[model samples]
Target chain A: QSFLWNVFQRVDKDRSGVISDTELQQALSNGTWTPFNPVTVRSIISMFDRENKAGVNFSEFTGVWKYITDWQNVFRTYDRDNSGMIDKNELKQALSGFGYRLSDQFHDILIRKFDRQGRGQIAFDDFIQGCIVLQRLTDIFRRYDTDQDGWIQVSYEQYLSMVFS
Target chain B: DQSFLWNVFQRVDKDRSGVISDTELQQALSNGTWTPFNPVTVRSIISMFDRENKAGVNFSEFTGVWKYITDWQNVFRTYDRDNSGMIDKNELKQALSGFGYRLSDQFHDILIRKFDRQGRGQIAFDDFIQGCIVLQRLTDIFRRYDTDQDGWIQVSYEQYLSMVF
Candidate 1:
């Protein structure tokens, strides 16, 4: 799509044929948007690296864009006020709708982690990180929810071991 | 009410040192008496009342923390417009706006998602309280970043891009 091309071109900054982290960051925080952490940026790149390449090319960037487009749609639907940012409460509702029964504590931690602007809010770009982190955490939860009871109840020791390990 | 706080503090002061250490504070929160908080938040709370920089909280400091929590509870009740003990998206906006924060819709949705543990599409009393905590913390952080005391931090497009990317 032309949208993808435009985004890719902008992000490719030096026309290196591949989008590096610096280029990606520059493209994302263009004007009103704030920056995301490098770890998140790296993880996002890895998510779209179908060929296991270190960075993303046009073809791979397309996939990433598509995925992002889908998430943006989801983000918008739940963002009833159209404020372009998702607060902690909205995040809880959206993720809960996605079948994640996260603890308030976990949610608190996640918001603090992804709220890159330190505004106690998440922008569209940072929301991508929230989605990715939630999906991954959900996967882990499901894996541990052996009884399929929609809850992953573990003892303090078990929880610590699982997380620290 | 003082007795209640004393009892809670006594329980949290596991080392019986007549003071509450960071680990003890975290442990109490982690033990489920309250929503789990991040280390940064814990440290912030501790530092707020640890005027002597003793890296711990005495009965007086613990009272400060309790008062802070109680204040948020009052704010939650004030914004629980329908008296349902839960706040919906709109109410959340009003509450934060009162605190000088005009959050984006996406940010609002994220707040709902973070706090609505019952998947009710609304924030219960506890969630509302938690939301207040996060908001106040962020406000403090923002103030810190607003170094010029101009109530804003002006970041150039180039500077912003480099920070996020």
Candidate 2:
């Protein structure tokens, strides 16, 4: 709880009691936080912004903090070498444990995207971001997997509507 | 595909217990009869097709694994230039380039470290296939975000937030 509070305080620049997208981005991009794309930052805010307020309040901030912590724990389990980073193979194994059946292409992108150190390894923060994104997509996939067969059944039109509408 | 599946299954299931166990998998992967992969990766592959939660894979479940990975196997074979049953760094670069991802030297090293569990500085067929799986899945997800058919993610912060959450 205290750790979350520290994180929230750091992110709530200007002491606004809420974190705007800009504030969140600044906090995230600082240090080893892996500078998420604006879209990703906003998507995160929106998910935790239960009131649809467009920003994350203290309570909502806790949600985000917990989310990160949970993924961090997941990341640690798969970092079998205890190298403080997860390699592409470990990432695949970890995600698979979470029930996501990803492709190698996707795995490569993920490794490139989050391997900010240029070491081809995902640091803790990077793993957190990756987990958040994949978890959100998994939630969306589950919704469309009506047959419960681990596959999403959506026509091209339906997919467009979901994305654009 | 069925013949390939049975042949591989028969080889892996040396005891012919109608199921594949961890020892059998490790033996098959390491003895050069099949591609070598890290034990963690091996476990992940098992989990994917272990539908009955028996902690082991039966003949039908093994076939399911083949069905799931046939495309990747094809991709692996294509880039395995020396036909030595493993892909070295140069081949990895070519393979990823064919998939439109040009990785840096450091990134390549990281990839090799992850997939070359044998520490041979090369990836075996199974590791290559695993890489393909992640690559394809990420491509699909990236397409979902690229939206405008522009081959880039051009979403506004607002649009992106709404699209994901």
Candidate 3:
């Protein structure tokens, strides 16, 4: 229950007690949104609609929190820098933790895509885009991230494991 | 689908008693209320039990052709893996594996908790089939939420990190 409370507090970014389409879409479009297929998107939408109100309310928001805890284990592994944030280098290293190695070209292109601030140092948003791109080889998520971070860093090792293994 | 009726009658006469009582038929139908049947449907149902009584279905009844129907014995035969006249977890897993989703330990645990009506360590054939049908339907919803096709919901640090920037 406490875990759920914490997640809701995080995802309800504006603390509006309801996540707007933009906020929900951002999370759904993250690097972890692999395949990001139609059915998958609809399902995420449905998850938010707890009361069957045709959209998410605070209670439905709580459900996502419970559902997302499994990923915490995966992320803890890659936070090697331990600064409470993951940069491109940390992301590349995290992929390596799961037996993946990014090509230098792929890595560079990814970094460029996620560095939205035009600053050499990638921020949290940059890491998010990097995570999204790594899920799909093609740039399906580029349009979604208007900020144009140099890369997406959504840790999608679980999906990658499904495909590769 | 008339054949399904015949199939039900055969199964209801589980004691080889040559006739189906109302209780047996209701039990066989999984507590589903039957719609008003025409005389023909009722007659056909009775005749099916009669024929099977004369020539025991053994295993061939499922696939054998009837006067106006096709056999589905193969359906039941496939799940009775040890030919033990009952279906078990291994048998259920084999049946559902073709659908592109593997039932996980968490699901198994949930089933044992909710659907094992008798509190038995193993599920009976009827209980197992009921559980499978219910769970299969539920997983239809689950597969939708599992956007990455990773057999679980999507999770990434970006979902958390996005809040800051």
Candidate 4:
């Protein structure tokens, strides 16, 4: 518990009793040490923030911290190359493992897009972001694919209003 | 703003039924490469603002569509760093970053590929807007819901439809 306290103290950079989004960003990093996606960080905050005030107290921070630590472990599993960054082929393998069919052109694009360093590779945070996005999109598509025909169509307003009010 | 958009509307509507159809949008709008806007995106836009299902967008609705396309033009212009009429992976990362996405480099590759539509290494304007829109929209939904590690939301169909339609 004291270990958690030490980490929280550092993360609460402004010494705010509650850990705010900015504070969380400062303290969190992907496996390769980039700031985690603000979206995911906020998602994590909401998950732990029982009061829905949009920030986390120490007790809540503990939960968030553990969640991230576990994600780090997950990242390690996918970074099988042990090269600090995940290359395209590695990502392809990972995606296939997740049950996504592999397409040559799509795989090629995924590498090109994620190679933020221009070295043709992906960093830790970027990997998690993609996986989450892919999974989320799939789940949403399935929602509209009620007949499971693997094909779905939505009107423009049906699409827009779902995203809007 | 209304008057300005109206001028554009009238120019496109021409000898039409007081509304803008997909043909007009495809005609009037453009990608950075001097090509007409993608027909698919134009059709989708018409479907969105053509509230009466009149197969044409009325004046006020055209106004919204005009501004939407205009804003996207600005985005494309800003990120097409080399003025290549396409957004390569690097440009895409910068654009997504500015928009608060900060995603994985690998997924970034996936987006460029999925939206490139022409099998080109870079993404064109129409595809970029489609990609960014879908990305942000679904993200908004995922963030709004309380999802668990398994990534399921407990939202009801009634609420989902209310948000959707």
Expressed between 0 and 1, the share of native interface contacts present in candidate 1 is 0.00
Report the candidate with higher TM-score, 1 versus 3: 1
Top model by DockQ, which number?
4
How far out, in Å, is residue B6 in model 2? 63
Q: DockQ numbers for every candidate?
A: 0.02, 0.02, 0.01, 0.04
How far out, in Å, is residue A104 in model 2? Answer: 5.3
The count of backbone overlaps in candidate 4 is 8
Tens digits of per-residue lDDT, candidate 2, B35-115, equal 334544466677677887666788888777656656667777898889987789988888888878744655556667755
Which order, best to worst by DockQ?
4, 1, 2, 3
Model 2, residue B91: distance off in Å is: 47
Best by lDDT: 4
Q: Ranking by TM-score, best first?
A: 4, 1, 2, 3
Give the residue spans of candidate 1 off by over 4 A: A1-11, A29-33, A57-61, A87-89, A101-114, A117-122, A150-161, B1-165
The lowest-lDDT stretch of 10 consecutive residues in candidate 4 chain A is: A109-118
The candidate 2 chain B region of ten consecutive residues with least summed lDDT is B156-165
Interface RMSD of each: 18.5, 14.8, 17.2, 14.4
TM-score of 3: 0.27
lDDT of 1 by residue, B1-165 (tens): 888989999999998999898778877653122444444456556767887757789998899987875676678778888876678888888888888875566677776876565568887654565456655554554455556666454332212211210
lDDT at position B117, candidate 2: 45
